Amino acid sequence: GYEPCWLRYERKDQYSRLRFEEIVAKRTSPIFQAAVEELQKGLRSMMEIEPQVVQEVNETANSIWLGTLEDEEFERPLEGTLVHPEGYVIRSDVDPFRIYIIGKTDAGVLYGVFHFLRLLQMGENIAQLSIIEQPKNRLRMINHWDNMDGSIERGYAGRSIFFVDDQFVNQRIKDYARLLASVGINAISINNVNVHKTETKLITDHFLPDVAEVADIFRTYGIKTFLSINYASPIEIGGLPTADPLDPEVRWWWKETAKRIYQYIPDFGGFVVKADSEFRPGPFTYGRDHAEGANMLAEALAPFGGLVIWRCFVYNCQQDWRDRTTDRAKAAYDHFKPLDGQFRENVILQIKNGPMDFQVREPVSPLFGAMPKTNQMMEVQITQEYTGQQKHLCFLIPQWKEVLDFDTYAKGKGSEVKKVIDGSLFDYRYSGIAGVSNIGSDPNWTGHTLAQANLYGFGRLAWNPDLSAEEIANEWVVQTFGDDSQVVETISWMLLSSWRIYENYTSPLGVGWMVNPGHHYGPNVDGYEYSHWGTYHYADRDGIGVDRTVATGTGYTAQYFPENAAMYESLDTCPDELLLFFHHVPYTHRLHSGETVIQHIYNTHFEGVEQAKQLRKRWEQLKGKIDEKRYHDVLERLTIQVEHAKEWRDVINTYFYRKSGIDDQYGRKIY
Amino acid sequence: GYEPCWLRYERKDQYSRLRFEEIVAKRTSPIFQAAVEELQKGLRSMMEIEPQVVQEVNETANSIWLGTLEDEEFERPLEGTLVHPEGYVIRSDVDPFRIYIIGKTDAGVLYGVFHFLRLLQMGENIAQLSIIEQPKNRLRMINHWDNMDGSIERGYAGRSIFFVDDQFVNQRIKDYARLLASVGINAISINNVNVHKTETKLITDHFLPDVAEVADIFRTYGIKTFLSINYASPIEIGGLPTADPLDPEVRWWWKETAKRIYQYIPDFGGFVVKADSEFRPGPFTYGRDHAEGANMLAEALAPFGGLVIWRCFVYNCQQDWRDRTTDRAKAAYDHFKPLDGQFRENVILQIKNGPMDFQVREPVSPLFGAMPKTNQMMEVQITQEYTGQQKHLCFLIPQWKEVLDFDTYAKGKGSEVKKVIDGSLFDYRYSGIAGVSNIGSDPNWTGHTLAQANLYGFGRLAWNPDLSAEEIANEWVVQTFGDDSQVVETISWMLLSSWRIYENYTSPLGVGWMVNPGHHYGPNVDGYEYSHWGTYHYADRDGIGVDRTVATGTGYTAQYFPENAAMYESLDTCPDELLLFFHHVPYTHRLHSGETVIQHIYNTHFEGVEQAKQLRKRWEQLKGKIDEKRYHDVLERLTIQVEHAKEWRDVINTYFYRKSGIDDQYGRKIY
Numbered sequence A, B: 001g002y003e004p005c006w007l008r009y010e011r012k013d014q015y016s017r018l019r020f021e022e023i024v025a026k027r028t029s030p031i032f033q034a035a036v037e038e039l040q041k042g043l044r045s046m047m048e049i050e051p052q053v054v055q056e057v058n059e060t061a062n063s064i065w066l067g068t069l070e071d072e073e074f075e076r077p078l079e080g081t082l083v084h085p086e087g088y089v090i091r092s093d094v095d096p097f098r099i100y101i102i103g104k105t106d107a108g109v110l111y112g113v114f115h116f117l118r119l120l121q122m123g124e125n126i127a128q129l130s131i132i133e134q135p136k137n138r139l140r141m142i143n144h145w146d147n148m149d150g151s152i153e154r155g156y157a158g159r160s161i162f163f164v165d166d167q168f169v170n171q172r173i174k175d176y177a178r179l180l181a182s183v184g185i186n187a188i189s190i191n192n193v194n195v196h197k198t199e200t201k202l203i204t205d206h207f208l209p210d211v212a213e214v215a216d217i218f219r220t221y222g223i224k225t226f227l228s229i230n231y232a233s234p235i236e237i238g239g240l241p242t243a244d245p246l247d248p249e250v251r252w253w254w255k256e257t258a259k260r261i262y263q264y265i266p267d268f269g270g271f272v273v274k275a276d277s278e279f280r281p282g283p284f285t286y287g288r289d290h291a292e293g294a295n296m297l298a299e300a301l302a303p304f305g306g307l308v309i310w311r312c313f314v315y316n317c318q319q320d321w322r323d324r325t326t327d328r329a330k331a332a333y334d335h336f337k338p339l340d341g342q343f344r345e346n347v348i349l350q351i352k353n354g355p356m357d358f359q360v361r362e363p364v365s366p367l368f369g370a371m372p373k374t375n376q377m378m379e380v381q382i383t384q385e386y387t388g389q390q391k392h393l394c395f396l397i398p399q400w401k402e403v404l405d406f407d408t409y410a411k412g413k414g415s416e417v418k419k420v421i422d423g424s425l426f427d428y429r430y431s432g433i434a435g436v437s438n439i440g441s442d443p444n445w446t447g448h449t450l451a452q453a454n455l456y457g458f459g460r461l462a463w464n465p466d467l468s469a470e471e472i473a474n475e476w477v478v479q480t481f482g483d484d485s486q487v488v489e490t491i492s493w494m495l496l497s498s499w500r501i502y503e504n505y506t507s508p509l510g511v512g513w514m515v516n517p518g519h520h521y522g523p524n525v526d527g528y529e530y531s532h533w534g535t536y537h538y539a540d541r542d543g544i545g546v547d548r549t550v551a552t553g554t555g556y557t558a559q560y561f562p563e564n565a566a567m568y569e570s571l572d573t574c575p576d577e578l579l580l581f582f583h584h585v586p587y588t589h590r591l592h593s594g595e596t597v598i599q600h601i602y603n604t605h606f607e608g609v610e611q612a613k614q615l616r617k618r619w620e621q622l623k624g625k626i627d628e629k630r631y632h633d634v635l636e637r638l639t640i641q642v643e644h645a646k647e648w649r650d651v652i653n654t655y656f657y658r659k660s661g662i663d664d665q666y667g668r669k670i671y
């Protein structure tokens, strides 16, 4: 019913086989069993071999050995340097052929088996392996925005694979868990952060048996299960008159709820919480702050080892567009930075990559680096809400690396975002990264076949943010489409270029938005320009942009450390790609590229469509080297992309010609 | 549970009573029974009397006599001049006191009883009555946009009173039928013109018993029942492979469906049809035209006397905004005028008042007067979709009179729209007017208490388009709020001024729209400006407006007869209130009022809010003269109106300052 994605395990030719007779499985835990089963599956599919699974080595057999450090006869120095529980070593014996996959814990053996299979899919020579791998981020999580009626909020890839008709739908969940574990993902929240009436009951006896069955499957693949919760649950399901976190009976209700969940799911991860945001209830309803609110839940989960993931996407969703001094981009920092040092140690603040809302380009959220005493994790959006909704191609890995590599200068040079969220800069006990899932029930999982690369690459970056976009794309393409060099170079080029192409024909120079309200797909320059969501570009007949300077604007630049604040504050040094996020400028202002702002708009919108046409041409040149079904699936979306790009180009160019009166330098067609 | 609206029948003081001992009911048909019951109800409530109902006069009793012409002992010349079946005479005997209510048919007696009760509510002296009344429009209809899940499309007054949970909900239906008959309405379609899956079954045995029960109630009040139909019903419910009107089995399926309905509802009115509009299926799907499509249904209903009401709201709902030669306003005329003479005699084309879509101001649809061989009826929208959604006050009767009194010049001077749709200009056998219902389950029926005046006034104009807005408002206010002269002058002033006030702060000079997409409430100047619905204003930094001239534009003016075409074609003679519907003009163009177009925009938006504030002030001055519940219901909406008017003012003024760069002449506050 559905694609294997990158775990194709395509049969090798006769010149690319391996000789093994046994798999030595030193443990029989559910994770070890999963790891053995995956190894058997990949070796049968790729190599046409069926080695016997044994618990003790045969010293004359060719073997793959699976074990932790304490299972080793001799513990050699490389695996001796492992410190992270999920780390592993893979090494070929240099003496029969033996591969040792040595994990610090059972999950390290599982990740090591997926790495060894990845090497095989990629055609690597395994005769002399010596590999050590340890993840950089402790939490590597997926958030689902699935509802129990089967819809998915901002889902562009079909219906929920978890829920239908206000109930739970499992073989597809197992295959999903395999995909997640193959790229190291170790945590999942299964339900929408906007928790509606049925979903509120996921923390009650009526649904916990079902939650536990799903948690059982994920546990076997090293994945902890979380639920998103309704902060007002003590009222809605617990029959209490209030949800105030300082009310003693509320506090007790949450403690009892925690105890009940852990009876069904003894390793339950904890709660994801959207509170006091977009009309979802929270501590503010009772005049409480978010440390009081998060700490109350944290205290309920603490005896059991659970975490509270408290989202920082908090802002005034009833902003007056007339009020130019109120800045939504400042809201998260202003709410949370004063609370540093007030949170319990099992609270993690989860902060989106940018301060507004997953736009095609945003600067980095100032909260990263600003709270040395509070755990932080970053949230990115794998589902392409503002980045083309899986109709347009948009490989998000280059954007995420720009965010991860941004130096906050919080402790001087070398204070990159990735060091904040991996916990090393400030010694966070719990931290990491989360991604909003792009999957659904479509047979290709992600709507656009090539959007499988975004789920893959999310997991790779969460494991090691220092991996290049180039090598992630290479890994993904080879595993998914094979090793023909034209196919690999072409699809890698398509992926690596796609975000810039989509940006070119959507909103200019960092200002964001210019999307249709509601569904958020397609061009509408004034879509939210007189609305109450704080998302304005202030275009008039003379110029455009948000003045976020301290000197004359909202003062948002001051939320950065001095080196970045100065860069953005000055009109002359602010990078072109963010100019209109930080400055209000005339259409005739000249950018670092030499272009005026208005001619930049025309250039990128005309040229963006030409680039989209080239994406499609380059894919067509692969006909015959890709199976027809995926060839045509992708070609259909690239054609949709080209036609919609023309709409983006002409709507934006006409809007700005109608406002600026300045023609295209080159005389190209503006309606 | 709900208000009596204008049928209050408030108790009279002791100096305003009537003496009657008997009601002579010469017939005992269900309509006569309804008429007697209403008379008994009004006389008991107003006069505290309970006359006995008898079938033969007592020559010494004071009496009200009810009968048709053939029941008269002596037929005097006035009732002798009646020709319309629903006409009646009311006259006091000039000899005991006797009032004769003499109808041409039983429905004329019912309308005559409601008129006599109206005179009593209004305090008129009935000692020497001599009244004759005959309706001008043969069809005086209400269209419901109710769905069977209980929602109402564009309903601002609560949920359906007919349906809930995909079934039928009747005492409220009886009281609704009384309100409709009191203002002469004689036809109703009970379900949305967009016929969804459950509603398609209203023409099948599963729901016809329920339809018949509702039809039974309306019949007693002289009202014929219609259903809206899904043109693709032969596929969806009849298991046929096509819905092509020329397919013989389709034709037969509709004939059998007609025969089945008439077995349950022997006087069934017929079908309302939305076809080939906004993605609803129709004859075009099979390459057929609308005469072929309407005539097929007409032939099915003809043996039974049914009518096909075929809506002309047909246009390209996939228009390219770049294409300035395609004009949605021309679509209905271009589709239907070439079909004149091709329709069966029981088809009526139902045409909205304007060629676009119920905007606050539109010019009159050119189809009126253009089809001398095809029955026409006009559709107006009582529910205030673009006229404030019953949050803002908007008494629509002045607008409807402008449309009704518009001279088309089709047969020279004196070819008013009202003469087209009353059938007199062209001798139409079936014609009239229909209004989209503004009611729902709210206890005050219409959402805004004062919107009851729009339902009342619709029925009054449908009976006699020559009634003044002033006298309709006077009738409505006295019956609903009493005869205190301050209350009557104030609420009449509020009503009569309200449409112009709402127009003043919404879209300028006839161009329409500037509303939020989707729900259509509140300001959004570019809301649909780059959309596919054909609703563009073309505002740029120099000017605004649609060029609909023959000389340089879309040529829409040529759809009018020469006198009107010339008026609109010339920039100098086009009325200011429609200028931007017909011309694209610079912001500095001077109107007949002396204002530039841009300063006109500022003036009416600032002053419109001041006028809304005055509506509220004048209502507040009535405290103590209105019951507190309706006082506060209305005051709450007027406060909502004032605050929303400020939003309309500032959004439009800021948009046009940002585009034009021209400041307000008077220095008032533009953000």
Ligand SMILES: O[C@@H]1[C@@H](O)[C@H](O[C@@H]2CO[C@@H](O)[C@H](O)[C@H]2O)OC[C@H]1O
Binding pocket: A278, A357, A517, A518, A519, A520, A533, A535
């Ligand atoms: O971040 C904000 C989004 O959460 C918001 O989402 C909208 C909420 O109201 C709904 O009815 C809309 O359909 C949904 O799109 O959009 C604006 C953005 O600022």
Ligand SMILES: O[C@@H]1[C@@H](O)[C@H](O[C@@H]2CO[C@@H](O)[C@H](O)[C@H]2O)OC[C@H]1O
Binding pocket: B278, B357, B517, B518, B519, B520, B533, B535
């Ligand atoms: O006349 C047109 C309306 O019928 C149209 O209605 C919209 C149809 O699509 C829906 O999803 C929207 O919610 C609804 O408002 O609006 C545009 C107008 O030109």
Ligand SMILES: CO[C@H]1[C@H](O)[C@@H](O)[C@H](O)O[C@@H]1C(=O)O
Binding pocket: A145, A153, A154, A193, A194, A274, A313, A357, A358, A385
């Ligand atoms: C779950 O709500 C989402 C919302 O649909 C989406 O439009 C916005 O981008 O992000 C919100 C969030 O991050 O909470």
Ligand SMILES: CO[C@H]1[C@H](O)[C@@H](O)[C@H](O)O[C@@H]1C(=O)O
Binding pocket: B145, B153, B154, B193, B194, B274, B313, B357, B358, B385
């Ligand atoms: C029933 O559809 C309606 C639609 O909701 C409304 O937005 C438009 O004004 O008029 C359509 C019509 O008249 O058919």
